[PDB]
Amino acid sequence: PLMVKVLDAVRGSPAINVAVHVFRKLTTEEEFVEGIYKVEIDTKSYWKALGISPFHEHAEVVFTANDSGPRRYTIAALLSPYSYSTTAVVT
């Protein structure tokens, strides 16, 4: 016998975030789960898994990468509930 119980009775006005998981029993992947409440903001990638036999004989390659510039990011509340409160962003 397997039982799980959460939050039987509630009187009032809360804020909640619930998650429940139960498990009973060149690249390979099997039987996985990814991304329950997942956040990604800025991510970069250049070269990945070109192939079996690239650039075998007598190759000449030049590789250069530049990253610059004016950028801004602004966030007030992230992944956090609130009740009976005040939030403001003023510029």
Minimal distance, residue 60 CB to a copy of itself, in Å: 5
Q: Which of residues 48-67 bind a copy of itself (CB under 8 A)?
A: 48-67
Name which of residues 5 to 44 contact a copy of itself (CB under 8 A).
5-44
Shortest spacing between CB 68 and a copy of itself, in angstroms: 3
Tokens of 46: 């250049």
Q: Binding site residues for L-thyroxine, as ranges?
A: 5, 85
| Count of residues near a copy of itself by CB under 8 A | 91
Quick check: 17 and 81 in contact, CB under 8 A? yes
Distance CA 31, CA 20 (A): 18
Pick out residues in 65-84 that bind a copy of itself (CB under 8 A): 65-84
Amino acid symbol at 88: A
- What SS3 state is found at 25? coil
